[PDB]
Amino acid sequence: FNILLATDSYKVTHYKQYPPNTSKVYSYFECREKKVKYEETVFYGLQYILNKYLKGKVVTKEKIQEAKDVYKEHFQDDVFNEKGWNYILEKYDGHLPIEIKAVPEGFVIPRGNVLFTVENTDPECYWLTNWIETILVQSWYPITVATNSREQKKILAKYLLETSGNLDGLEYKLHDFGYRGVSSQETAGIGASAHLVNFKGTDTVAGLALIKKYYGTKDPVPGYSVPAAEHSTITAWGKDHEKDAFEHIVTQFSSVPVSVVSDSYDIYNACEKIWGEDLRHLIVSRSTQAPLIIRPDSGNPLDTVLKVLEILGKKFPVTENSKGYKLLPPYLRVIQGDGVDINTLQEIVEGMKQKMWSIENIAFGSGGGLLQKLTRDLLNCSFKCSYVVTNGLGINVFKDPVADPNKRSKKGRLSLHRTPAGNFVTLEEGKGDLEEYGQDLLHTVFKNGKVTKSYSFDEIRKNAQLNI
Amino acid sequence: FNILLATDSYKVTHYKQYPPNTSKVYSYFECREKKVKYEETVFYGLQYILNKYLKGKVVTKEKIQEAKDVYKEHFQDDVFNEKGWNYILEKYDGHLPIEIKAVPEGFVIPRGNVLFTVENTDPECYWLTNWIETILVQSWYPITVATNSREQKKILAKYLLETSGNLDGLEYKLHDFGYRGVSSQETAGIGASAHLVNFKGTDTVAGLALIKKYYGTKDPVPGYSVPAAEHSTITAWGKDHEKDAFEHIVTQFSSVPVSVVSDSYDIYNACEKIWGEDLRHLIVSRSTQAPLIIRPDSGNPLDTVLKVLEILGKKFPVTENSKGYKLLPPYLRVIQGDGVDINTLQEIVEGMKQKMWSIENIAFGSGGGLLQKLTRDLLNCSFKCSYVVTNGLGINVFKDPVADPNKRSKKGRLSLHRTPAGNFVTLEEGKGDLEEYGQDLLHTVFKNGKVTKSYSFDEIRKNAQLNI
Ligand SMILES: O=C(O)c1ccc[n+]([C@@H]2O[C@H](COP(=O)([O-])O)[C@@H](O)[C@H]2O)c1
Ligand SMILES: O=C(O)c1ccc[n+]([C@@H]2O[C@H](COP(=O)([O-])O)[C@@H](O)[C@H]2O)c1
Ligand SMILES: [Cl-]
Ligand SMILES: [Cl-]
């Protein structure tokens, strides 16, 4: 990895564009307001970026020469700031003279607030603040995964509490199926780690090693899975032998939970005749700690869940819980793992509630909806210069495009505070210095090539908890 | 990287679910037909995956032990196939006994056709075929980027040819702005490389080194950029000094093209009064090889482009080209880099055509729309087992879910052929062996830990050309 080649091309040319006599460039990141509405965001992911990409000796003579050679051909011109990068090499042994202050990871902050700020610590490196905008703005992705996952946890929490009276099992109710559906191995790990801020069930193994290496947990692992079938392990038996596949798999996994995809040919037949009759004797014998989890994987998601439950409720003994909602026997559950995103999740649990089914009966799996079907504009994650020093005077700078007030940016030196009512406010124009609003909640997390404050994954999970 | 830890968790448990005495599992990848329709796909990106993740000694003693320890805790049980992985280590020095056949990279193939196949070459490793599904299915991402980019090139080619009579400059008409808007550094490189299959303009630097390392070009680099401003380099001068910023930047870059974002405060004032009056003498003096490129970045994309052009056409000498379309002087161009995706791209060029503006006048930048706002379900990229051998007998296998005939999969051993009319057909059930359709177009690209056939980036670009 070469940080000199990890920026937007045009940023290579910006050192010639700032005002002369500029000694400081100060920039901030927010999830900009736009006036499920995503009113508050989980701040998560910067610590990964700091350690993987920004800390330590990130400049070498070889990296300078490599960048110089690439850019000469890429621009067909000599515009690369070799002098400025060699300065950092010789002066700071290749450590970035940058200070980053950030809200603690896991903090849940309303839209439109400063979440981190970046500035250069040496006047010669005024150009460096926005060089690393591109790498830092990629924090949008773990922020947005963690936020969208938590918003799904809010939906699940509400309907589970309403239909059952408690939140038992909530942390396993949204399973990460997204490994194949994301754009890269690296995205898999980052996105899966952001989901585990809120939940404990994952098949995206990549997230485990990321958390261990960059954040840490008291527990051996941050997330868990169960054995489960795929269409290959069912269909390989032949169409006429689906029952034999089911019987073999539940017997191989007789003492742990086992998920069995049941829609290879006819999900409703599988539920009513194969599970509900031919193999019923292998299901009602199972432990409460080792249920069969029937997995549909096609059709209209709500219609299929509802029909599957109706089928199973006629072949297995249903109870009515203390809230009036129907409950399958404890050895039998369902996981809907197709078509799940935050919108269909809500439709399904509302539809179950209207048909008097407890959310205890169901868990969800989500892949592309959870980790890939997300963009930087969902929360308007954005990085802008708000303050410069030129000729020794600080000036508050901003954009304010005539045709879109939503893209107006903040002015001056910024700080994040609690309000008297316990909410959040970002103070602009250095007004945090007046000390009317208590302590700035941004802390220095990076300075001159060293990570200066770190959070464990356990702390992040605590910070990101739901009120309830 | 540890490929033992680079699969969906549940696949760790599948070796215990296949039929006993299974010696062969054979699977295939397609962009499934679903009933911009995306009727044909660019096959690109498998060679990256083969070289970075699958080739060579990918199993070691340490990797087996690492995976054993992680899965013990992740499943809270001993289901990991330590013996099977030890077999590969001991028998093949950690090389995967897998054979992959694939259509040549860059090939443009209609939906619903086999693009690559995977099978084990040792009967003990029947479970390995679908272990590596997860990593191989991530090829959906370079396929989809390349396809969606090529579809945008088709739109630009149509309207450029109608409004100018040629395709001059086509390969620079859609510039990759997506580095900050993707989910990771790895995704940035893969996605930018996929865009460079069709175009030459990019600010996602990460794409260059990926191509150099994994594909290769005769030219020094596969893509190019120009100097350009951002809001920080304009607003740092102060709101009242926007003119001074503009003058400085165009004078710093007097003899190469320079793009200057012009909407910090009022795009229309910047065009009409700052560029169109105050600084006009610095624009009309510029060379045809070094235009000013004015960049709006906010507002309704079509409305803003049309109003910017109308303004500029009243302040600068417009000609009428041989097709009857209006054309700015050669020292002045526009780039629309906000809100561009395949849908708005079409809207803008059609709206320009209706107002008699040549597409010569404009280029587009696209970031999230080009590299991030894409999912595996756009082309229904999918990997399924179609053939197994069990007790020495091959059987053709498939899924066929009752509620969604679109998820029906192909049966048996597959091959890809030219039809008598020169189209493509996928033959199922081993019928390619009949030789009624000539030779299979798939080539073995990986066998027993080695890449056996490969393509330069130059060949890929040739294969992906538009008909025109
Ligand atoms: O069942 C599992 O343990 C499992 C783990 C990973 C993926 N899957 C399946 O993979 C598919 C991913 O699709 P998607 O659209 O959510 O990206 C979906 O059918 C899931 O049920 C299933
Ligand atoms: O002008 C450039 O060279 C340039 C290079 C990289 C990114 N950008 C800008 O960054 C923004 C990317 O936003 P998006 O939503 O397309 O991902 C958009 O306003 C672009 O104009 C601009
Ligand atoms: Cl599956
Ligand atoms: Cl910009």
UniProtKB/Swiss-Prot annotation, chains A, B:
Top-level taxon of the source organism: Eukaryota
CC annotations in GO: cell junction; cytosol; extracellular exosome; nuclear speck
EC number annotated for this UniProt entry: 2.4.2.12
Expression sites (tissue/organ): Expressed in large amounts in bone marrow, liver tissue, and muscle. Also present in heart, placenta, lung, and kidney tissues.
A single GO molecular function term of this UniProt record: nicotinamide phosphoribosyltransferase activity
Pathway: Cofactor biosynthesis; NAD(+) biosynthesis; nicotinamide D-ribonucleotide from 5-phospho-alpha-D-ribose 1-diphosphate and nicotinamide: step 1/1
Keywords: Acetylation, Biological rhythms, Cytokine, Cytoplasm, Glycosyltransferase, Nucleus, Phosphoprotein, Pyridine nucleotide biosynthesis, Secreted, Transferase
Database matches in SUPFAM superfamilies: Nicotinate/Quinolinate PRTase C-terminal domain-like (SSF51690)
NCBIfam families: PRK09198.1
The name this protein goes by in its record: Nicotinamide phosphoribosyltransferase
Gene source species: Homo sapiens
Gene: NAMPT
